[PDB]
Enzyme design. Structure first.
Site, PDB file in Angstrom:
ATOM      1  N   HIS A  44      -0.004 -11.509  -1.718  1.00  0.00           N
ATOM      2  CA  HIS A  44       0.570 -11.474  -0.642  1.00  0.00           C
ATOM      3  C   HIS A  44      -1.525 -12.483   0.071  1.00  0.00           C
ATOM      4  O   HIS A  44      -0.995 -12.290   0.971  1.00  0.00           O
ATOM      5  CB  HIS A  44      -0.057  -9.948  -0.117  1.00  0.00           C
ATOM      6  N   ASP A  93       0.777  -7.394  -7.079  1.00  0.00           N
ATOM      7  CA  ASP A  93       0.490  -8.244  -6.251  1.00  0.00           C
ATOM      8  C   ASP A  93      -0.540  -9.168  -7.441  1.00  0.00           C
ATOM      9  O   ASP A  93      -2.427  -8.520  -7.659  1.00  0.00           O
ATOM     10  CB  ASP A  93      -0.802  -7.456  -4.765  1.00  0.00           C
ATOM     11  N   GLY A 186     -11.064  -9.542   3.453  1.00  0.00           N
ATOM     12  CA  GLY A 186     -11.645 -11.222   3.176  1.00  0.00           C
ATOM     13  C   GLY A 186     -11.498 -11.096   1.723  1.00  0.00           C
ATOM     14  O   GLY A 186     -12.372 -11.740   0.965  1.00  0.00           O
ATOM     15  N   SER A 188      -9.110 -10.124  -0.456  1.00  0.00           N
ATOM     16  CA  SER A 188      -8.347  -9.896  -1.875  1.00  0.00           C
ATOM     17  C   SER A 188      -8.053 -10.658  -2.538  1.00  0.00           C
ATOM     18  O   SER A 188      -8.449 -11.557  -1.845  1.00  0.00           O
ATOM     19  CB  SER A 188      -7.016  -9.004  -0.448  1.00  0.00           C
ATOM     20  N   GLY A 189      -7.759 -10.904  -3.599  1.00  0.00           N
ATOM     21  CA  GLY A 189      -7.862 -11.598  -4.628  1.00  0.00           C
ATOM     22  C   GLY A 189      -8.629 -12.012  -5.176  1.00  0.00           C
ATOM     23  O   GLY A 189      -7.963 -13.014  -6.389  1.00  0.00           O
TER      24      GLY A 189
HETATM   25  C1  LIG Z   1     -12.529 -17.187  10.080  1.00  0.00           C
HETATM   26  O1  LIG Z   1     -11.121 -17.203   8.858  1.00  0.00           O
HETATM   27  C2  LIG Z   1     -11.684 -15.388   9.125  1.00  0.00           C
HETATM   28  O2  LIG Z   1     -11.487 -15.023   9.627  1.00  0.00           O
HETATM   29  N1  LIG Z   1     -10.483 -15.120   7.889  1.00  0.00           N
HETATM   30  C3  LIG Z   1     -10.378 -13.631   7.177  1.00  0.00           C
HETATM   31  C4  LIG Z   1      -9.225 -13.809   6.314  1.00  0.00           C
HETATM   32  C5  LIG Z   1      -8.664 -13.315   5.593  1.00  0.00           C
HETATM   33  C6  LIG Z   1      -8.350 -11.537   6.579  1.00  0.00           C
HETATM   34  C7  LIG Z   1      -7.561 -10.552   6.283  1.00  0.00           C
HETATM   35  N2  LIG Z   1      -7.719 -10.209   4.444  1.00  0.00           N
HETATM   36  C8  LIG Z   1      -7.058  -9.232   4.680  1.00  0.00           C
HETATM   37  C9  LIG Z   1      -6.130  -8.249   3.316  1.00  0.00           C
HETATM   38  C10 LIG Z   1      -4.290  -8.525   4.168  1.00  0.00           C
HETATM   39  C11 LIG Z   1      -2.899  -9.589   4.426  1.00  0.00           C
HETATM   40  O3  LIG Z   1      -4.320 -10.364   4.000  1.00  0.00           O
HETATM   41  N3  LIG Z   1      -2.356  -9.761   4.651  1.00  0.00           N
HETATM   42  C12 LIG Z   1      -1.547 -10.489   4.494  1.00  0.00           C
HETATM   43  C13 LIG Z   1      -0.519 -10.582   3.903  1.00  0.00           C
HETATM   44  O4  LIG Z   1       0.659  -9.065   3.633  1.00  0.00           O
HETATM   45  C14 LIG Z   1      -0.848  -7.992   3.278  1.00  0.00           C
HETATM   46  C15 LIG Z   1      -1.331  -7.439   4.136  1.00  0.00           C
HETATM   47  N4  LIG Z   1      -6.855  -8.103   3.397  1.00  0.00           N
HETATM   48  C16 LIG Z   1      -8.067  -8.184   2.303  1.00  0.00           C
HETATM   49  O5  LIG Z   1      -7.849  -9.179   1.902  1.00  0.00           O
HETATM   50  C17 LIG Z   1      -8.554  -6.577   1.371  1.00  0.00           C
HETATM   51  C18 LIG Z   1      -8.040  -4.999   1.701  1.00  0.00           C
HETATM   52  C19 LIG Z   1      -8.774  -4.204   1.087  1.00  0.00           C
HETATM   53  C20 LIG Z   1      -9.067  -3.963  -0.181  1.00  0.00           C
HETATM   54  C21 LIG Z   1      -9.408  -2.494  -0.636  1.00  0.00           C
HETATM   55 CL1  LIG Z   1      -9.906  -3.118  -2.506  1.00  0.00          CL
HETATM   56  C22 LIG Z   1      -9.766  -1.790   0.532  1.00  0.00           C
HETATM   57  C23 LIG Z   1      -9.675  -1.507   1.042  1.00  0.00           C
HETATM   58  C24 LIG Z   1      -9.418  -2.726   1.492  1.00  0.00           C
HETATM   59  N5  LIG Z   1      -8.440  -2.915   3.143  1.00  0.00           N
HETATM   60  C25 LIG Z   1      -7.812  -2.048   3.701  1.00  0.00           C
HETATM   61  N6  LIG Z   1      -8.065  -3.018   5.883  1.00  0.00           N
HETATM   62  N7  LIG Z   1      -8.620  -3.677   5.050  1.00  0.00           N
HETATM   63  N8  LIG Z   1      -9.378  -4.194   4.289  1.00  0.00           N
HETATM   64  N9  LIG Z   1      -6.733  -8.217   6.128  1.00  0.00           N
HETATM   65  C26 LIG Z   1      -7.226  -9.654   6.959  1.00  0.00           C
HETATM   66 CL2  LIG Z   1      -7.282  -9.395   8.490  1.00  0.00          CL
HETATM   67  C27 LIG Z   1      -8.980 -11.865   7.777  1.00  0.00           C
HETATM   68  C28 LIG Z   1      -9.763 -12.920   8.451  1.00  0.00           C
END
Ligand SMILES: COC(=O)Nc1ccc(-c2[nH]c([C@H](CC(=O)N3CCOCC3)NC(=O)/C=C/c3cc(Cl)ccc3-n3cnnn3)nc2Cl)cc1
Length: 238
Positions: A44, A93, A186, A188-189
């Site tokens: 993702h 994923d 932030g 994930s992965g």
């Molecule tokens: C200055 O740079 C920035 O600001 N960079 C920046 C870079 C990335 C993100 C960011 N990353 C994500 C992804 C999903 C995603 O990227 N996507 C897009 C693709 O389709 C799927 C969702 N989820 C996760 O990383 C973790 C989820 C999670 C994991 C567990 Cl174990 C438990 C609870 C969890 N969460 C439930 N709600 N939040 N977290 N969402 C956002 Cl918003 C925000 C900011």
């Protein structure tokens, strides 16, 4: 990371910060070094990523302030997404990034051991989720790498906590029944690292959850032991 503390430099040397160049440079996801030219992360993470050309891997980083225009990185040669991946909430994923150049192992960066075929039988007491993700659902990317100890939850117990979802055995959950400590936006992965027989193993990849560290809502990870064959097939290609 919700309810975590700052890491000590060199604690999680396999941990990387995966950045994007388009439109502006910013952190995209976490990740793990599993070979000299291999990073294992979440499928993702590449939602909308049209080319490996806009990606940069930064290993041996504790603070995000360490990343400047002069900071060295690894270019991505190839993005290999699991071909059964539709969405995090369904599974598969997992993705591999083949780097353009070789990671040189040292005191700041090394690989993490994958779970063994016979390691499916073991119970993990010492697990930790690491990342530069938010400390809460409406936050910002953290400068210093947070670390949090979370207990592993059964498939049965995780399935009870996620009514309306389908928690497969290709998924692995971790959480305190009362919340407080979990992964967030932030992270994930990135890894879910477990220490067993004085060795760290890559038990999970941070995937999804309903909110961050909510009571009776464990975070869901890619159960890496179920993907050792795919990882080997893709990293060990003749
Ligand atoms: C200055 O740079 C920035 O600001 N960079 C920046 C870079 C990335 C993100 C960011 N990353 C994500 C992804 C999903 C995603 O990227 N996507 C897009 C693709 O389709 C799927 C969702 N989820 C996760 O990383 C973790 C989820 C999670 C994991 C567990 Cl174990 C438990 C609870 C969890 N969460 C439930 N709600 N939040 N977290 N969402 C956002 Cl918003 C925000 C900011």
């Amino acid at each position: 990371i919700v309810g975590g503390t700052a890491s000590v430099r060199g604690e999680w040397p396999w941990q990387v910060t995966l950045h994007t160049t388009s439109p502006t440079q910013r952190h995209l996801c976490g990740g793990s070094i599993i070979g000299n030219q291999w990073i294992l992360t979440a499928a993702h993470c590449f939602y909308g990523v049209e080319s490996p050309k806009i990606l940069r891997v930064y290993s041996g980083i504790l603070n995000q302030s360490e990343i400047k225009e002069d900071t060295s990185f690894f270019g991505v040669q190839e993005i290999i997404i699991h071909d059964q991946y539709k969405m995090a909430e369904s599974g598969y994923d997992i993705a591999l990034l083949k780097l353009e150049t070789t990671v040189g192992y040292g005191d700041s960066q090394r690989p993490i051991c994958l779970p063994s075929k016979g390691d499916r039988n073991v119970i993990y007491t010492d697990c930790w989720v690491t990342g530069w993700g938010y400390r809460k659902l409406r936050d910002k990317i953290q400068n210093t790498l947070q670390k949090a100890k979370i207990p592993l939850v059964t498939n049965e117990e995780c399935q009870k906590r996620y009514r309306g979802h389908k928690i497969t055995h290709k998924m692995i959950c971790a959480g305190y029944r009362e919340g407080g400590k979990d992964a967030c936006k932030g992270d994930s992965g990135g890894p879910l690292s477990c220490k067993h027989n004085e060795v760290w193993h890559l038990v999970g990849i941070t995937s999804w959850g309903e909110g961050c560290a909510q009571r009776e809502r464990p975070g869901v990870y890619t159960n890496v032991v179920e993907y050792v064959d795919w990882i080997l097939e893709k990293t060990q290609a003749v």
